[PDB]
Write a protein that binds this ligand. Sequence first.
Ligand SMILES: [Cl-]
Ligand SMILES: [Zn+2]
Length: 315
Amino acid sequence: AMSNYSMSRGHSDKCVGAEDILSEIKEAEKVLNAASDELKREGHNVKTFIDRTSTTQSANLNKIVNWHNANPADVHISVHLNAGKGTGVEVWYYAGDEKGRKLAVEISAKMAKALGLPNRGAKATKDLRFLNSTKGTAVLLEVCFVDRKEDANAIHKSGMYDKLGIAIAEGLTGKTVAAKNPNRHSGAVVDSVPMLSKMDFKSSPIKMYKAGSSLLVYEHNKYWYKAYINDKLCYIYKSFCISNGKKDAKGRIKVRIKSAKDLRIPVWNNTKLNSGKIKWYSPGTKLSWYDNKKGYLELWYEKDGWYYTANYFLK
Ligand SMILES: [Cl-]
Ligand SMILES: [Zn+2]
């Protein structure tokens, strides 16, 4: 999260691009949307533009360039597909623009790897109006060819637009995306809660207590009870528990973990797993998450952004 991107599709719905096995504008719009969606999920600000009305090439380019210059960005991207029956991926940049060359090299490589096509590479030019006339740093993607069956098969493989959105986002930012399908899992909220070594959900659970189970604890503070396991002090979160009344001569309190129906497990809007906005779920609730081995789980909500929880709360 922290860069600004301005991204446009090539061509106009009324002055189209290449058309053969693939439609350039159809495919380019799908890639643009995937890349935009991914960059936004990664926390960046993204503006996009698609010309639906220009009926000539010059009007289309004037409109595209004007829009980019009206919408400053760290990088400007134009998304195209190629024609001429070569095969594979290339990225154009303004000759002599070192920042653009480096982006072009990385984006081209990443896309080619996602698609499983050859990398034709980064290519320098001073002949493209888009690159010449856009004030900021600019690259022009030629994702794959519209007139090559290898390329058509590739871009139509299951989940390829997602994979290309990832490739473009990683090429632009130099950072691996969090929402990567290999690291995705589906399961459900567990029905047990931890006795922890510290008053920190990111600590080690010394022991897990199942819904409905009874245990003996001491008061500690507003949010935590304490107990000794093997003469070591450990902690359990009070909201997981039901208690009525000290009778015990030493001030021990008998508590019970809430039933599976009433227990609620936290999912937080911060990686510290502390305060902020929390979603509270009943045991058994089905969720999908990403485990990128960061020491916590990562959950994407279209409406609410990234949330996080402890490794032991989802299985
Ligand atoms: Cl004791
Ligand atoms: Zn084009």
